[PDB]
Symmetry: D2
Subunit: 319 residues, 4 copies
Amino acid sequence: NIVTLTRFVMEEGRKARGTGEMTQLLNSLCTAVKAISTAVRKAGIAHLYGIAGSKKLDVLSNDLVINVLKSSFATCVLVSEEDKNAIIVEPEKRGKYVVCFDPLDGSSNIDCLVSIGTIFGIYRKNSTDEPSEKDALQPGRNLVAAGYALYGSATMLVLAMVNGVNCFMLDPAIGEFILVDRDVKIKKKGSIYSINEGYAKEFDPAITEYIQRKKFPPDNSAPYGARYVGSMVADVHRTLVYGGIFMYPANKKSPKGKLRLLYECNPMAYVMEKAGGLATTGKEAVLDIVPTDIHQRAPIILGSPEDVTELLEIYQKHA
Amino acid sequence: NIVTLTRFVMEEGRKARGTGEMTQLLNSLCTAVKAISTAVRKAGIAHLYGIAGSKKLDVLSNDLVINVLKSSFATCVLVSEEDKNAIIVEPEKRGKYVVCFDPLDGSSNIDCLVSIGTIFGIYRKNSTDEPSEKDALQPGRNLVAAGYALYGSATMLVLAMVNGVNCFMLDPAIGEFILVDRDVKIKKKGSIYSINEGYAKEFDPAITEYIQRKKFPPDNSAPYGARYVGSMVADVHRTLVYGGIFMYPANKKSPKGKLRLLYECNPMAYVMEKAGGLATTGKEAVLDIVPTDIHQRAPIILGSPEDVTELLEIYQKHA
Amino acid sequence: NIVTLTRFVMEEGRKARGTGEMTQLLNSLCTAVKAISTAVRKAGIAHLYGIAGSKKLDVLSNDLVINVLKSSFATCVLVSEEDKNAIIVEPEKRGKYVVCFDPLDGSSNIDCLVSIGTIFGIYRKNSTDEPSEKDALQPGRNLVAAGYALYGSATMLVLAMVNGVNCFMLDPAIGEFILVDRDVKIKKKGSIYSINEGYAKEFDPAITEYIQRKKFPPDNSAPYGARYVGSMVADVHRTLVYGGIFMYPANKKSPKGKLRLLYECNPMAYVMEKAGGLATTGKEAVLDIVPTDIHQRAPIILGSPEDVTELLEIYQKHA
Amino acid sequence: NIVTLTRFVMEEGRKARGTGEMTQLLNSLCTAVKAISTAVRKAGIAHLYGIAGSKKLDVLSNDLVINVLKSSFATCVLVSEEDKNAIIVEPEKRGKYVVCFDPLDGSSNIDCLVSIGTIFGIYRKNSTDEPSEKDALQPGRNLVAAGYALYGSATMLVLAMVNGVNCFMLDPAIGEFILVDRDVKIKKKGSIYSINEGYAKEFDPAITEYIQRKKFPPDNSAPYGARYVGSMVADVHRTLVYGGIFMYPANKKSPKGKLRLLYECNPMAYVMEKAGGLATTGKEAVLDIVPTDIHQRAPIILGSPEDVTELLEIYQKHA
Ligand SMILES: Nc1ncnc2c1ncn2[C@@H]1O[C@H](COP(=O)(O)O)[C@@H](O)[C@H]1O
Ligand SMILES: Nc1ncnc2c1ncn2[C@@H]1O[C@H](COP(=O)(O)O)[C@@H](O)[C@H]1O
Ligand SMILES: Nc1ncnc2c1ncn2[C@@H]1O[C@H](COP(=O)(O)O)[C@@H](O)[C@H]1O
Ligand SMILES: Nc1ncnc2c1ncn2[C@@H]1O[C@H](COP(=O)(O)O)[C@@H](O)[C@H]1O
Ligand SMILES: O=P(O)(O)OC[C@H]1O[C@](O)(CO)[C@@H](O)[C@@H]1O
Ligand SMILES: O=P(O)(O)OC[C@H]1O[C@](O)(CO)[C@@H](O)[C@@H]1O
Ligand SMILES: O=P(O)(O)OC[C@H]1O[C@](O)(CO)[C@@H](O)[C@@H]1O
Ligand SMILES: O=P(O)(O)OC[C@H]1O[C@](O)(CO)[C@@H](O)[C@@H]1O
Ligand SMILES: *[C@@H]1CC(=O)N(CC)C1=O
Ligand SMILES: *[C@@H]1CC(=O)N(CC)C1=O
Ligand SMILES: *[C@@H]1CC(=O)N(CC)C1=O
Ligand SMILES: *[C@@H]1CC(=O)N(CC)C1=O
Ligand SMILES: [Mg+2]
Ligand SMILES: [Mg+2]
Ligand SMILES: [Mg+2]
Ligand SMILES: [Mg+2]
């Protein structure tokens, strides 16, 4: 039997005996992602170019996520990469979930048709205080659900929750995601490393050494191949699906790293851990950082455990 | 006024006073590419997964190109990356054009949702001999038309002919490509370099030196950023659209390079030259190589002229 | 706030405090209908016509409904117009719902591109006996849910449940139904009558008289217009949405009428009553017939109450 | 070999040795019709209903036809049901063709999801005068091409030209029409008659008699079935494809009939004659009427020759 995402979410919801609030939240997200995907793939562009005489994607994207999420009646605080402040949802529309998201990531690559994606993280609100931005400032270890949709050759939604990681391909003919990979586990050790080497001159010494190992294995094994798409979601997904390592460590231009903690790193740290991989800054597990700002950045190295561990040891060694 | 690809091909055809054979050829290709794109984006996958109880993409892809091209009644010799021998078309279906193509490229990246593409090159048959594979063995300088379709965030067809390079976005809602960039010119000098550094230990000395320049500019300018998707069509298109350099030089694993001369390098060499860029092996212009085998490989460095020229000078210097 | 069908079903489910079984059932149906719609509108037909070298719609249709419904884990007995016997679902896949449906209706009109549709009725299984066909033999008054999807200019799903009738337009771009008409009420009296007059010579005398009234109003009011598409779902939907009357009374060729009781008449009788209209055979309310065979037929007159009542009075008068 | 509409138009163009102007015209139309079809089937409606916070179909429809047709550079005078005056195209955009069209017909049926369609007729401009509305006032016998697209269960384009009638199904997955019926011939005699009987009290005496024959065959043959969708394009297409007769004769409300001569009747008269059928007002062949106003109406009876002839004889008899 074929399993759609809507059924998958619904059975899981039933299993956990939820009141169905989170299920509605997940149904919404899932709707939002289909709307973004159709917009990404440029359906209807001929209208912009005057086919009948007569918004930018990342703005449209953000607006779909915000409106559809408010529509779920399941959230109370949203954080979007696109908005300077946490969005507090209106009382009449308020539920218990806090959702951090990046509506459209890798848009420095929309002119180039580069694979892009949406990243989401979902927290339960615990405090009884009138909902506020501090509700977003929870370490990633407290995620209830997290994943991303990727708009690449095809569109996939990957959703990690307490019980594993699942990939659902979008069948754009019928507007339905199809379970295709169940209980996904990253391989222990990979063959690909993924970093922007253009920063070779700002790299710290453990990264420099690690890059040399990959190219000239001190033990005379096969050198890793290199891949760097420049879309976190594209690169992380290849990592998840094929193994290897993905790095965005701190550099002089970005001394606390470049990627964002709340709505890029953490979600991906979460998918990686439930898939058996690791996600570190080099000094600490990503998921254990207690954030202090909703747009805080962090360095991140993630992927196959043996690989991330080999780099951690090099950071350790450079005491 | 909006301009579709079908109208663009047709006006150009009219302008050149063609008998309309090449126009039919280009209309077919354009159809084929839409069929591949819908298959790439996985429409109808739910059927494979048993939505109603009850082929691989690159095989499907190849079959669409062959059948649609035969359908144009405009070709006599096809070369596909997927077929060991040139396909000679049947007399009743025979026209004057020779088409070299790669039906689906970067499929080592379909499990990973990596952007993939189709690359085509079109030659006129000149000899009067019964059509044969030697009809494919023409230096790329003799191309009449060439381009690629990219299946990335969105689908684009790029078509270069004697009079410039044009990009047409696919609007999947109505099955129509829309002219979006006219007369495209690569910038003289870029900021991105694109190579698989995992081969750092097989690289020849001009490549090694060039990579160091990009990372540590001897003149203290800004270091290039690195991008490597691992799909020739994705990487070349970013190059075309944003400038920079793309390299696949020879290595010990691949001593004559890896990419294919007839249906990957040449088409891209052609798009690059009509867009004002360069495409060299390091010793000679790609388009001037007289091929001797339909699956011959060549090293290729291509992109922005100042950039390719800086590398050529380093090859020259290492006399 | 926009309301999708998935959210609508889910909130209603929550409201009724269901265990979510019926919700899964309704989610499935809703999926099935999108798959049928894409097949109806002929996506992918080029493959049948050899675009890459190398089932009938109503068979495909039936198979989608059966497989997707089994997939819901919510049903135990299915009745399809297409299957001679009730389908008993397997124990491991068994739930409490009995679903009578017509997978694709008005296919005598697929060669002609006539609007066609899917009709469904859902009963709860009450008896404790090992599920069997008698579980389908429930008067329509016991329906829990019922409606149809129409594949006409656009695709609409209409769903009637205890609390009213709702119409959801399919947005085929994102595979999502959008609530567009809430709590739909048929108008008391209409201006259109819908019957196949080609049977004028078999018509009983109350129908003959009623047809004359519509054309030559004995009171000198405006004569009704006539519409007869020949697709029950098309004609009933126009009735629902614009008012008037729809008739398929008994004739010599079909002495108990032509339409089917379990999976055409009853569902439509149910939509009509919750929308404020009537559905009679001429002697009794359709919804009160206790069926004795799963493929039993019945005469049906349905639509706006004043209109159906005017015809009932004529049947009464012809004592 | 599969045949797309674009190839079909192009080969025919080649065969007739056209300069390719009409080919561009037909390519445009074909594009326009795909844009209308996607709009009809309501892709993107969720945007109207606020999926991201934040025109009517027949207006949109009209605008697509006008802009795409101007885009062909092939026309000089357009007549649309929607515009009070002929549209004269601008000199820089001017070609030789006159196109009469009805952008979206049967919209009195968009609330009801009734099958609707677009009807077009194409004339060559013969006079040398500065193009004007009299260029539209040509009897239908002078058509060069004519047909309609139908938005019904699926979308079909039917195109009649001097050499026969051809039907092309739209495959919405790839935005391509597929030849499915070649050289279509209506059957000599049919079994269906199609008229709005609600006008029984205004009908002239030959229509009244003809209707009685269909229901009570004076020769004791089988009575015709009745079908009346209320969309000219739906009813005419069923007629073409299944045979029978379609009538919209004059009534007191509409003493010169209701349908329009330039952009409904004539095109359909033309398709019918090239398919072997007839199209009469009852006194004269539709195609031979010399129109005097661009929005002139005419009575029309059309379909299978034996059938139209049986009605003509009854009009003759009622001397
Ligand atoms: N659809 C679902 N899938 C997986 N887990 C869920 C789902 N719904 C609820 N849960 C678990 O049950 C908790 C409470 O559910 P709720 O009543 O929906 O807020 C959630 O925070 C999850 O831990
Ligand atoms: N559609 C077209 N676009 C651009 N150039 C064309 C086109 N059709 C023909 N040409 C030029 O005219 C030559 C002969 O055309 P043909 O008669 O189509 O083989 C082609 O090889 C091209 O050089
Ligand atoms: N999604 C729903 N929409 C409307 N009514 C429902 C829904 N789910 C359940 N109900 C009502 O609750 C009953 C039991 O629900 P269930 O536990 O899903 O079988 C159903 O038979 C309906 O009467
Ligand atoms: N694509 C076509 N299909 C069928 N007939 C055509 C086509 N193109 C041209 N013709 C015939 O050739 C005439 C002149 O063509 P043109 O030069 O396109 O205006 C047209 O009016 C038609 O009679
Ligand atoms: O150009 P850089 O510095 O290598 O940045 C690449 C990163 O930038 C982003 O687009 C911005 O978030 C990421 O998706 C991607 O990983
Ligand atoms: O793994 P490598 O050796 O870097 O190869 C990448 C290249 O391989 C291909 O997929 C094979 O043609 C190209 O599209 C791409 O440029
Ligand atoms: O040709 P008839 O006898 O008027 O039948 C029309 C009816 O037939 C069906 O196609 C068969 O169920 C109905 O949808 C429609 O109402
Ligand atoms: O309601 P009536 O008078 O039967 O009109 C039906 C006709 O009206 C139109 O919608 C108006 O052109 C036609 O397509 C159709 O044949
Ligand atoms: C496209 C445009 C751009 O600037 N890049 C990032 C290097 C792209 O991929
Ligand atoms: C996906 C799968 C694979 O092996 N790679 C190439 C390194 C992918 O991108
Ligand atoms: C199409 C084909 C057919 O026989 N009819 C029913 C009268 C159609 O509508
Ligand atoms: C829909 C709405 C309307 O008034 N009718 C025409 C009788 C429809 O079909
Ligand atoms: Mg981001
Ligand atoms: Mg290749
Ligand atoms: Mg039926
Ligand atoms: Mg009209």
